[PDB]
Design a protein around this ligand. Structure first.
Ligand SMILES: Nc1nc2c(ncn2[C@@H]2O[C@H](COP(=O)(O)OP(=O)(O)O)[C@@H](OP(=O)(O)OP(=O)(O)O)[C@H]2O)c(=O)[nH]1
Lengths: 51, 228, 50, 76, 249, 50, 230
């Protein structure tokens, strides 16, 4: 059903847990990096431009 | 129909002159409408008091040097530009500096008058050397709104006044710096809402909270004609 | 790329603009001047910096 | 200290057994045999263990010495 | 339509079979969003029984990629048309011309790094007007085979499902045409024979206590894929020869 | 020919016009190119890729 | 020491297009009010729009009527634009019933007291058959901003009737807004400016009421903002 309570629990679990982002041609060790996730609307992943 | 009014407006004043203000949650898009309205009115149209003109008894042009003052006339002009004066009743007053001897001529050395208050008695103005150390000047303080550069007065100064009358940029608005950041903030289910971070540094005379408050007051008062 | 363009534009100098030869008491005042439209974002100027 | 672990590496120069020490501490916290030594900021036990390592309050020597201390206490 | 074309777009549109083109030009007698009926000119009329030409158009059928392929009538009652005129516009076609996409007002400038790289920023105004909204017609198939444990059935009786989910099925167990569904919803009710549960002891205890008669039938109903929501546009039923068709069939 | 046709429309012949920043209301320096371009929505839809 | 802006002549060039001027504006607030008003006007002006449609013989948007030329989907798209002014109630159910050959325009809608059809000439559909007859019920609500079909499902409330056809609600009558600050030299004064707000709408909100409503909303937000309870 996914009511507000589920979103609060998800927010609390996600807080300090980091996730790994990878791009199919991992040329060097920086092809895999870990980031702290921020929940957002939409179906697209937003990554910081500089990296 | 029915709008959303913001709650939880916390203000952490690090360094009494520096105040950060957080404001949420606001309907979509109003972050920038209020940030900009506030900034523009606050910065450009704010009643204040400031030094406008200066007279040195000794020199005819602002690029010459006076004997025994290490700082050039430019430096003393800039030191006077920053000087924060708050007058209660009178609109324009003429302050005099007469100092002698070795050491730093500071704002404290101004003649202590009734209606004029110097918020920083220890603000450095000039450094005077030894054994000659003669400094005399007349600084004019006037009240006005906003920022007026010297170049427009010198342009429109058809009333020619005698030599030595060195114009300085009049910084009336007591707000030295202001900016607003808009950031994503969601009210438990609506994500299309925003947070306003207002960082403001003023120059002592007015406390930041009062600056914000009177700015918004005057804007609303202008708006007064239409609000039903 | 975009960043570098922005910074290049921001820092670049121009022969003549608004506020040629003004003396500003500090960077915050510089920013106040630019945001009020009393000076172009790039124009040669004398500034006090610590 | 969920930005840069530089101070923990300045405390422990290996930069690898750091993660093992932090894992031992944070698992000692998860299975509630112990309690946090730092006021929590709604953080999970990972960054809590990092915060405990970086301030010099906890390292390998304090874990082993205090562990055998509590063990010998629990012997009675 | 493209504002800036090359002239070839009419050739491309006509030559494809998606446009409907007049074979003997004449006057359009009847126009409907399903057929265009045209009376041929006395000039081109075959001597023995020429009569009129009727063009049946194709309405939303599923394309190979699941996009919509529907033709809309262009001309109106009483318009005179000539041999080789464009009667009905196919998908992505305007008045005979190729209209692959749509033309928007673009401004070349950096807007706070939201178009940093080749990414594109777009205004709510385009979505408001629904000018880039696509129709996709997906197909789903529920097949009831006969296992050696017993033939499966399409009945609406689905063990331990809330009747809220059943509400949208008819007595035959097929969604009503035009019902709006969402991911997880049941489209075709189907049950499969299965026995020898071999429940674990504790389950035996629970069955004893509460009286939970275990139903020997597994659930199979064709539920909608995750995160898809639309209207059931059409249904087809294929029964093998021999079996007794059901009410809906 | 484009210049001519643009003149027939009563539009700036250089094809750039000054734009005002919709958030703050300030004008942009250096007018920017605006105009209509024909764009397409490709079959690579995020709805499927996620 | 300030002045204040009073609403002076408010000319209407067309039924949709109106220019509203504010004469005694102090230097510097021309742009501030221009922009603030522009923002509020475009974003928050409450308007009316069709929310849902029920046609009898049609199960879903994709089918087709006998004797009409537009598809059901095109009839929905045409109804989305219908500009209507409702005075008292929030939810009106208009009934359109026409037969015979002809273009069924909005004027054929059954005229209720409280509803004003701004442009009765607006076309809806084209019949093509002497006996072809369409009947429908259009449910029109009041609302502000933009709500799509898919979000409104939250309030489903037993949408059981398959005949109900949801339409995206563009609940906003203001189409376009521009402002011009021009020096309004009054024979006795130094630095005053005039605001000329040119606004184009679908002909539902009258200009004065629009401007007033915007000023109201901004004033309320500034009310909350001035007081600071740390
Ligand atoms: N990249 C970047 N980081 C910023 C910036 N401003 C603040 N930070 C860092 O982000 C963290 C802020 O987190 P908090 O203020 O504690 O609030 P939180 O609960 O969301 O984590 C701080 O690091 P921290 O995890 O708290 O480190 P530490 O001080 O605990 O060792 C801070 O140093 C910035 O402008 N850019």
């Amino acid at each position: 059903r996914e009511e507000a309570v589920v979103w609060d629990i998800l927010d609390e679990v996600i807080r300090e847990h980091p996730v790994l982002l990878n791009r199919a041609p991992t040329l060097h060790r920086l092809g895999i990096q870990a980031f702290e996730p921020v929940l957002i609307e939409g179906k697209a992943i937003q990554l910081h431009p500089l990296v | 129909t029915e709008f959303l009014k913001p709650r939880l407006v916390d203000i952490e004043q690090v360094s009494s002159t520096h105040a950060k203000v957080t404001l949420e949650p606001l309907e979509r898009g109003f972050g920038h409408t209020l940030g900009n309205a506030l900034r523009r009115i606050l910065l450009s149209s704010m009643p204040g008091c400031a030094v406008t003109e200066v007279e040195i008894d000794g020199v005819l042009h602002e690029y010459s040097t006076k004997e025994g003052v290490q700082e050039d006339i430019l430096e003393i002009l800039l030191n006077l530009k920053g000087l924060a004066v708050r007058v209660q009743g009178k609109d324009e007053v003429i302050l005099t500096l007469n100092k002698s001897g070795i050491g730093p001529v500071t704002a404290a050395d101004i003649t202590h008058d009734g209606d004029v208050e110097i918020v920083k008695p220890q603000h450095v103005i000039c450094h005077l050397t030894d054994e000659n150390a003669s400094i005399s000047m007349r600084i004019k303080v006037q009240r006005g709104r906003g920022y007026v550069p010297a170049s427009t007065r010198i342009h429109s100064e058809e009333d020619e006044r005698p030599i030595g009358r060195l114009l300085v940029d009049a910084c009336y608005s007591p707000v030295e710096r202001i900016a607003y950041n808009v950031e994503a903030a969601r009210v438990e289910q609506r994500t299309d809402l925003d947070k306003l971070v207002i960082e403001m540094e003023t120059n002592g005379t007015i406390d930041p909270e009062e600056a914000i408050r009177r700015a918004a007051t005057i804007l609303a008062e202008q708006l007064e004609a239409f609000v039903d | 790329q975009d960043v570098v363009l922005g910074l290049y534009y921001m820092t670049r100098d121009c022969v003549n603009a608004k506020g040629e030869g003004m003396v500003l008491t500090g960077p915050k005042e510089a920013e106040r001047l630019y945001r009020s439209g009393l000076a172009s974002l790039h124009a040669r100027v004398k500034v006090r910096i610590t | 200290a969920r930005v840069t672990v530089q101070d923990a590496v300045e405390k422990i120069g290996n930069r690898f057994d750091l993660v093992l020490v932090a894992a031992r501490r944070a698992r000692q916290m998860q299975v509630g045999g112990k309690d946090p030594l730092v006021p929590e900021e709604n953080d999970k036990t990972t960054v809590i263990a990092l915060r405990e390592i970086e301030e010099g309050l906890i390292n390998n020597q304090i874990l082993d010495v205090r562990e055998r201390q509590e063990q010998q206490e629990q012997e009675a | 339509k493209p504002l800036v074309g090359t002239g070839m777009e009419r050739a491309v549109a006509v030559d494809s079979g998606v446009t409907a083109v007049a074979k003997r030009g004449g006057v359009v007698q009847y126009v409907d969003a399903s057929r265009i009926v045209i009376k041929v000119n006395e000039d081109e009329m075959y001597p023995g029984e020429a009569g009129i030409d009727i063009y049946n158009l194709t309405k939303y059928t599923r394309s190979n990629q699941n996009t919509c392929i529907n033709q809309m009538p262009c001309v109106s009652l009483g318009e005179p048309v000539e041999r080789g005129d464009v009667l009905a516009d196919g998908p992505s076609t305007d008045l005979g011309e190729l209209a692959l996409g749509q033309n928007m007002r673009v401004a070349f400038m950096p807007w706070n790094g939201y178009n940093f790289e080749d990414s594109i920023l777009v205004s709510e105004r385009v979505v408001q007007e629904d000018r880039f909204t696509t129709i996709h017609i997906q197909e789903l198939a529920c097949v009831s085979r006969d296992t050696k444990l017993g033939p499966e059935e399409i009945t609406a009786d689905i063990p331990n499902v809330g009747e809220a989910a059943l509400s949208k099925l008819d007595e035959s167990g097929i969604v009503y045409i035009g019902a709006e569904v969402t991911g997880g919803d049941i489209l075709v009710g189907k049950v499969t024979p299965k026995g020898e549960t071999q429940l674990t002891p504790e389950e035996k205890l629970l069955r004893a206590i509460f009286g939970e008669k275990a139903s020997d039938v597994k659930d199979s109903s064709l539920r909608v894929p995750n995160g898809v929501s639309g209207t059931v546009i059409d249904v087809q039923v294929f029964t093998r020869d021999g079996v007794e068709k059901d009410k809906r069939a | 020919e484009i210049k001519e046709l643009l003149k027939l429309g009563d539009l700036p012949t250089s094809g750039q016009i000054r734009l005002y920043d919709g958030r703050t209301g300030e004008q942009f320096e250096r007018p920017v190119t605006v105009g209509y371009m024909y764009m397409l929505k490709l079959n690579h839809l995020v709805d499927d890729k996620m």
